[PDB]
Amino acid sequence: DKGSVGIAMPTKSSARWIDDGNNIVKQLQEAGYKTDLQYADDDIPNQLSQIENMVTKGVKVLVIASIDGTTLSDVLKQAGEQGIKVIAYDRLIRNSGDVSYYATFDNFQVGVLQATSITDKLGLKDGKGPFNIELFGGSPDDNNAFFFYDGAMSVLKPYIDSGKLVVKSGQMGMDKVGTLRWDPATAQARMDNLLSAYYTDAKVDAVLSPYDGLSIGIISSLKGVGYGTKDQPLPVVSGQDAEVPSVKSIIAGEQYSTIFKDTRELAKVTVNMVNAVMEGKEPEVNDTKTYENGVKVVPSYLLKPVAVTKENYKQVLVDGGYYKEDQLK
């Protein structure tokens, strides 16, 4: 009876949130808490309704991975009036003074890693170039998407400036490359139209993809126009989440890279935070400057992500138990 914790996850259409949810609940119950885990099927009104009910139920702490956190201002105010502490999980909740802590991966660094996998593969440090690249971003209502993109551009921009990388479509910036709701179908269509408009004569050499779901759609589009044959190899395509279909793609020599974010580690950080709040102590945080949310800078704990390719998938994903060997066959 250490108290109840409400856990709001955005959707099951992206594999990780099932893992986040399972891992948070497993560790919280091990720590002796009761849990109320809900998934919103990416429906913003539903997620709001779910969190409202957690508040009415009288949970002591809310752990929220929001679809669009800006929609939660009113309910989080009510949570604060009731003495409920709020942990933003993975994605920062913006526009609210009632967000107490933020547990996440180093999102800027995720972007650095995605871009670096591409630049390393292209040999840009060896003076290789020029190459054509197209850019994709996440959902614009996901605060993480801006960090993934910015982190990537910290690596790519100097090469784009020098001409060694060329964005042939000229499309850059989250307002132009963002992919609403991280929808793979949308990214696939955009890739379709980039190819027809700008790559009838030229070839795509790389695509910055911020998420595995998108990477698979992008690859499908590329195969639709003849890439992925012996004569015409796929461009270098990044990713994130180490979803099984993308890992299989990487093993097959299609998708080039992904980013492994161990949800077991993020659940553990979250439990540490819950424990602290419940004991009346200050949670461990390692970043109190970065994550401005529009009202304040939320004290945060950042975990370090790991880049995965065909070269290291076994050691990173299987040896550490995230997946079993057979799942990747």
Ligand SMILES: OC[C@H]1O[C@@H](O)[C@H](O)[C@@H](O)[C@H]1O
């Ligand atoms: O769901 C699409 C993406 O959403 C981001 O906010 C999250 O950090 C990524 O790991 C990925 O899951």
